[PDB]
Design a protein around this ligand. Sequence first.
Ligand SMILES: NC(=O)c1ccc[n+]([C@@H]2O[C@H](COP(=O)([O-])OP(=O)(O)OC[C@H]3O[C@@H](n4cnc5c(N)ncnc54)[C@H](OP(=O)(O)O)[C@@H]3O)[C@@H](O)[C@H]2O)c1
Ligand SMILES: Nc1nc(=O)c2nc(CNc3ccc(C(=O)N[C@@H](CCC(=O)O)C(=O)O)cc3)cnc2[nH]1
Ligand SMILES: [Mn+2]
Ligand SMILES: [Mn+2]
Length: 159
Amino acid sequence: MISLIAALAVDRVIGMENAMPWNLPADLAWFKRNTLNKPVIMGRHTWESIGRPLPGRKNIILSSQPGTDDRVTWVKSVDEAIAACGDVPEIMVIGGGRVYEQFLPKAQKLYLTHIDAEVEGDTHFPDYEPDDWESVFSEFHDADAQNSHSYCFEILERR
Ligand SMILES: NC(=O)c1ccc[n+]([C@@H]2O[C@H](COP(=O)([O-])OP(=O)(O)OC[C@H]3O[C@@H](n4cnc5c(N)ncnc54)[C@H](OP(=O)(O)O)[C@@H]3O)[C@@H](O)[C@H]2O)c1
Ligand SMILES: Nc1nc(=O)c2nc(CNc3ccc(C(=O)N[C@@H](CCC(=O)O)C(=O)O)cc3)cnc2[nH]1
Ligand SMILES: [Mn+2]
Ligand SMILES: [Mn+2]
């Protein structure tokens, strides 16, 4: 019952200095629509990148150190993170790079936004095995006044 959601620029770049530079409100909105009312699991750097809880979602932060904010749930292993979600039928893993690597093998579904942008990055989505993933949906959007790049929302399910 595990899904990854991520937005990927050119070469699978997902981040640079604890930021997406990416500003795509339509994508952030897609993210909200696919995560609201589900638990989200993230790594500590992603927690710091976002800088505040995501409302309307149980926020679960992976770290090895004691937690530093009781507005969210802290866990110290992948298995503890899954357990902490409660007994639900969709858990959303929201990154970052190191967390996506761990959860990939388990996960059954990938919500990937392909952004037509070149960013010189320090974090990448895993180089996953494409043969193992069926595209069940793909919608492309051209750039507009609110969104400076074109981008494509797709959902993959394991074959
Ligand atoms: N494009 C996107 O969709 C997207 C999504 C998410 C994030 N990002 C970007 O990705 C970057 C952050 O990713 P990152 O790869 O540097 O870091 P990350 O995966 O967010 O965080 C890694 C940290 O999480 C903790 N952690 C990971 N696995 C753990 C485990 N099994 N057990 C216990 N703790 C564990 C550790 O914290 P401790 O060191 O405290 O132990 C580890 O250093 C930023 O640039 C961010 O903006 C992009
Ligand atoms: N498709 C996708 N896009 C992303 O932007 C994204 N971001 C993360 C991790 N980082 C973030 C960063 C910001 C917000 C955010 O503020 N989103 C709001 C709605 C839009 C907004 O108000 O900015 C939210 O409540 O989720 C969410 C996740 C993980 N997977 C992703 N996946
Ligand atoms: Mn571009
Ligand atoms: Mn397709």
